[PDB]
Amino acid sequence: GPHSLSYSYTAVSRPDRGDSRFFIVGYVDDTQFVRFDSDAPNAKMEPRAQWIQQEGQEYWDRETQISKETAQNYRVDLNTLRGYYNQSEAGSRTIQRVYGCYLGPDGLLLRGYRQDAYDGADYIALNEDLRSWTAADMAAQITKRKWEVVNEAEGERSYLQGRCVEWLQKYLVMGKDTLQRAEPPKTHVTRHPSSDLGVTLRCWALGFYPKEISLSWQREGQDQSQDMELVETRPSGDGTFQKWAALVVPPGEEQSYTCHVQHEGLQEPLTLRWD
């Protein structure tokens, strides 16, 4: 799949404490590499992948500066959206924002995007043409009209078509041995008794990257997805992922059932079975 650089902003108001908190996480594909938290002791943009660490203080000073300016603006934006919705000032509220660029084969923008949310609900989004906005309601139309007036989309489009893709390319090189090579799952099957009329068979896939994987059980070629418990993919804690797929079989049929793993790190699709 095409590579992407994206940032997630989270602004949360605290009217009690009188302030607000601002978070940033930066991702290249499924890999986090920077973070900012305005509640941190002398908060700054910090590295969170080994390969971004080589950046000079110039890079860090800039990102830090932009983070704090942005956090500042959000402290009033939180209060503005509260006014748009005629909401009280008592409770904590939240604005979220994602934006990013997908890298094309020609080294140019494949697709740029940006979406904002208020209290977990869609607020406003940049269209695919990167020249206009879609507002989800009245309040967002106000915001939309302001961004039209001062041509906010052109700042976004210029960033996404230029700076965003160019830094992505640089990040793809800096962390090539982790971002650009696929990491196949370490797989195996476990077996767990229960009643007289059931034994749970669980297929493991561990330490894989990227996140996209395919686990499936088959009984003599026939799909068993109907009764296959499949867990949500989860992070290992070291930049890779985990997933398992299980199902209950009669206590002798173990060999009549097969797990089927597809992941782009694997050269060929796999077929595992209990031993």
Binding site: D77, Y84, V150
Partner: peptide, 9 residues
């Protein structure tokens, strides 16, 4: 690297 756009809602 971050987009630098101070824009108010």
């Amino acid at each position: 690297a971050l987009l630098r756009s101070a824009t108010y809602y």
